[PDB]
Design an enzyme around this catalytic site. Sequence first.
Site, PDB file in Angstrom:
ATOM      1  N   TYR A  76       0.851  -1.234   0.000  1.00 61.12           N
ATOM      2  CA  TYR A  76       0.000   0.000   0.000  1.00 61.12           C
ATOM      3  C   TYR A  76       0.834   1.209   0.000  1.00 61.12           C
ATOM      4  O   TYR A  76       1.837   1.311   0.657  1.00 61.12           O
ATOM      5  CB  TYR A  76      -0.895   0.044   1.235  1.00 61.12           C
ATOM      6  CG  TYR A  76      -2.309  -0.442   1.005  1.00 61.12           C
ATOM      7  CD1 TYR A  76      -2.485  -1.759   0.592  1.00 61.12           C
ATOM      8  CD2 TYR A  76      -3.451   0.333   1.248  1.00 61.12           C
ATOM      9  CE1 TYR A  76      -3.789  -2.336   0.427  1.00 61.12           C
ATOM     10  CE2 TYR A  76      -4.775  -0.201   1.067  1.00 61.12           C
ATOM     11  CZ  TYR A  76      -4.922  -1.552   0.644  1.00 61.12           C
ATOM     12  OH  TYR A  76      -6.173  -2.207   0.445  1.00 61.12           O
ATOM     13  N   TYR A 119      -9.330   2.844  -2.375  1.00 60.30           N
ATOM     14  CA  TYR A 119      -9.924   3.302  -3.641  1.00 60.30           C
ATOM     15  C   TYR A 119     -11.283   3.953  -3.398  1.00 60.30           C
ATOM     16  O   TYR A 119     -11.516   4.945  -4.033  1.00 60.30           O
ATOM     17  CB  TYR A 119     -10.156   2.155  -4.647  1.00 60.30           C
ATOM     18  CG  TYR A 119      -8.872   1.595  -5.264  1.00 60.30           C
ATOM     19  CD1 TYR A 119      -7.852   2.435  -5.798  1.00 60.30           C
ATOM     20  CD2 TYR A 119      -8.742   0.205  -5.323  1.00 60.30           C
ATOM     21  CE1 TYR A 119      -6.691   1.868  -6.404  1.00 60.30           C
ATOM     22  CE2 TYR A 119      -7.530  -0.359  -5.871  1.00 60.30           C
ATOM     23  CZ  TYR A 119      -6.536   0.527  -6.334  1.00 60.30           C
ATOM     24  OH  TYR A 119      -5.441  -0.024  -6.921  1.00 60.30           O
ATOM     25  N   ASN A 137       1.624   6.045 -19.346  1.00 56.68           N
ATOM     26  CA  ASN A 137       2.797   6.851 -19.013  1.00 56.68           C
ATOM     27  C   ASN A 137       2.392   8.306 -18.974  1.00 56.68           C
ATOM     28  O   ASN A 137       2.891   9.018 -18.062  1.00 56.68           O
ATOM     29  CB  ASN A 137       3.882   6.675 -20.080  1.00 56.68           C
ATOM     30  CG  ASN A 137       5.252   7.082 -19.545  1.00 56.68           C
ATOM     31  OD1 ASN A 137       5.700   6.555 -18.526  1.00 56.68           O
ATOM     32  ND2 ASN A 137       5.912   8.063 -20.214  1.00 56.68           N
ATOM     33  N   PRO A 139      -0.606   9.644 -18.117  1.00 55.47           N
ATOM     34  CA  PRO A 139      -1.295   9.824 -16.783  1.00 55.47           C
ATOM     35  C   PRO A 139      -0.242   9.841 -15.665  1.00 55.47           C
ATOM     36  O   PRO A 139      -0.399  10.642 -14.751  1.00 55.47           O
ATOM     37  CB  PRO A 139      -2.244   8.602 -16.735  1.00 55.47           C
ATOM     38  CG  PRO A 139      -2.735   8.486 -18.209  1.00 55.47           C
ATOM     39  CD  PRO A 139      -1.356   8.667 -18.935  1.00 55.47           C
ATOM     40  N   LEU A 140       0.729   8.912 -15.621  1.00 55.92           N
ATOM     41  CA  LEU A 140       1.749   8.936 -14.545  1.00 55.92           C
ATOM     42  C   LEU A 140       2.566  10.186 -14.519  1.00 55.92           C
ATOM     43  O   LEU A 140       2.811  10.736 -13.454  1.00 55.92           O
ATOM     44  CB  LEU A 140       2.512   7.628 -14.605  1.00 55.92           C
ATOM     45  CG  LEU A 140       3.443   7.405 -13.420  1.00 55.92           C
ATOM     46  CD1 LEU A 140       2.711   7.350 -12.033  1.00 55.92           C
ATOM     47  CD2 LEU A 140       4.183   6.054 -13.640  1.00 55.92           C
ATOM     48  N   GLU A 141       3.024  10.570 -15.726  1.00 56.47           N
ATOM     49  CA  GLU A 141       3.746  11.905 -15.818  1.00 56.47           C
ATOM     50  C   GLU A 141       2.971  13.043 -15.210  1.00 56.47           C
ATOM     51  O   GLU A 141       3.538  13.817 -14.461  1.00 56.47           O
ATOM     52  CB  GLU A 141       4.081  12.098 -17.321  1.00 56.47           C
ATOM     53  CG  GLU A 141       4.541  13.516 -17.796  1.00 56.47           C
ATOM     54  CD  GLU A 141       5.975  13.763 -17.569  1.00 56.47           C
ATOM     55  OE1 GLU A 141       6.787  12.849 -17.765  1.00 56.47           O
ATOM     56  OE2 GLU A 141       6.293  14.958 -17.248  1.00 56.47           O
ATOM     57  N   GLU A 142       1.696  13.156 -15.560  1.00 61.73           N
ATOM     58  CA  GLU A 142       0.791  14.219 -15.056  1.00 61.73           C
ATOM     59  C   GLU A 142       0.576  14.033 -13.586  1.00 61.73           C
ATOM     60  O   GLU A 142       0.586  15.049 -12.834  1.00 61.73           O
ATOM     61  CB  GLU A 142      -0.497  14.148 -15.819  1.00 61.73           C
ATOM     62  CG  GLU A 142      -0.226  14.470 -17.335  1.00 61.73           C
ATOM     63  CD  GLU A 142      -1.392  14.024 -18.227  1.00 61.73           C
ATOM     64  OE1 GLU A 142      -2.452  13.592 -17.749  1.00 61.73           O
ATOM     65  OE2 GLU A 142      -1.126  14.089 -19.480  1.00 61.73           O
ATOM     66  N   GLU A 173      -0.446  -2.097  -7.726  1.00 59.09           N
ATOM     67  CA  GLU A 173      -1.143  -3.144  -8.358  1.00 59.09           C
ATOM     68  C   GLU A 173      -0.346  -3.886  -9.408  1.00 59.09           C
ATOM     69  O   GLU A 173      -0.471  -5.158  -9.587  1.00 59.09           O
ATOM     70  CB  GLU A 173      -2.478  -2.675  -9.046  1.00 59.09           C
ATOM     71  CG  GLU A 173      -3.463  -2.045  -8.127  1.00 59.09           C
ATOM     72  CD  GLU A 173      -4.124  -3.002  -7.117  1.00 59.09           C
ATOM     73  OE1 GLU A 173      -3.743  -4.189  -6.964  1.00 59.09           O
ATOM     74  OE2 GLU A 173      -5.084  -2.513  -6.440  1.00 59.09           O
ATOM     75  N   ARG A 176       1.693  -6.313  -7.541  1.00 67.21           N
ATOM     76  CA  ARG A 176       0.852  -7.438  -6.993  1.00 67.21           C
ATOM     77  C   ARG A 176       0.521  -8.452  -8.144  1.00 67.21           C
ATOM     78  O   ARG A 176       0.438  -9.652  -7.884  1.00 67.21           O
ATOM     79  CB  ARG A 176      -0.413  -6.911  -6.323  1.00 67.21           C
ATOM     80  CG  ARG A 176      -0.242  -6.163  -5.085  1.00 67.21           C
ATOM     81  CD  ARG A 176      -1.582  -5.612  -4.747  1.00 67.21           C
ATOM     82  NE  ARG A 176      -1.417  -4.736  -3.545  1.00 67.21           N
ATOM     83  CZ  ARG A 176      -1.926  -3.512  -3.432  1.00 67.21           C
ATOM     84  NH1 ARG A 176      -2.685  -2.986  -4.410  1.00 67.21           N
ATOM     85  NH2 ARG A 176      -1.725  -2.861  -2.298  1.00 67.21           N
ATOM     86  N   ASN A 191       2.425   4.120 -26.121  1.00 66.85           N
ATOM     87  CA  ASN A 191       2.160   5.465 -25.609  1.00 66.85           C
ATOM     88  C   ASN A 191       0.683   5.839 -25.830  1.00 66.85           C
ATOM     89  O   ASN A 191       0.366   6.977 -26.298  1.00 66.85           O
ATOM     90  CB  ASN A 191       3.085   6.522 -26.333  1.00 66.85           C
ATOM     91  CG  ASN A 191       3.203   7.794 -25.503  1.00 66.85           C
ATOM     92  OD1 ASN A 191       3.020   7.721 -24.210  1.00 66.85           O
ATOM     93  ND2 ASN A 191       3.362   8.925 -26.119  1.00 66.85           N
TER      94      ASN A 191
END
Length: 263
Positions: A76, A119, A137, A139-142, A173, A176, A191
């Site tokens: 977590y 969640y 990628n 979304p993660l960057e942002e 996740e 996991r 991308n």
Amino acid sequence: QYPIINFTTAGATVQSYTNFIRAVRGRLTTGADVRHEIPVLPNRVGLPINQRFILVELSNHAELSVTLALDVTNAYVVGYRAGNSAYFFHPDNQEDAEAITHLFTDVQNRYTFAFGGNYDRLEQLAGNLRENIELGNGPLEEAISALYYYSTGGTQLPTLARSFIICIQMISEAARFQYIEGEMRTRIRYNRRSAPDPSVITLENSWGRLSTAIQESNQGAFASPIQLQRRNGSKFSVYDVSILIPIIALMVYRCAPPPSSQF
């Protein structure tokens, strides 16, 4: 003191992300506990505080960095640091509250959110469910920028909640579930961001149940089947650990491994 794994979204590739996820699994599990070829996370009971967390340092093409803290017992995300501020989700109990005092100890500004980090709570804050939040990628960057600008008022609470939702799925996740790591690989290779399908959501929601079903099984056979969803939303029945060896990478500790009666 706790181990640090580094990942950046800038120029990320399937290989760099795979190397990251393998490294996080390597720091979450010790090799002590493997059942049906499936590693089990450390038992919370008696686990010394010096072995309780790992740190994931995320950087992005914007040249920003944040550091997430993961609990080794469950993978977590329990909080994060951005430069001079740290932020923790509301702890579930007294001992977790003590444990998080051992994180980011020289940070000059420490905040505990008044909400927990599950969640359901985060979806409410975000005003969107997992199934409507694109991953990949971009979304993660942002999300790394959003978490970085929170302390200065740049980031609205809903966008901070959405950013946690992205991080949790693409780090915890994916650690996991090889299945979810391979869903992220796909989005990173092309991308192309996209929201998780029912195969992803049902596996996330079933992690604890699957971990308990496997650990209580009779030689791998579930006493009660578990229903998952395929990509198209159709039902997939799980009767045995066998079908999950390509799918689940790590389990939460739920029971002691029985003395296996050996033929």
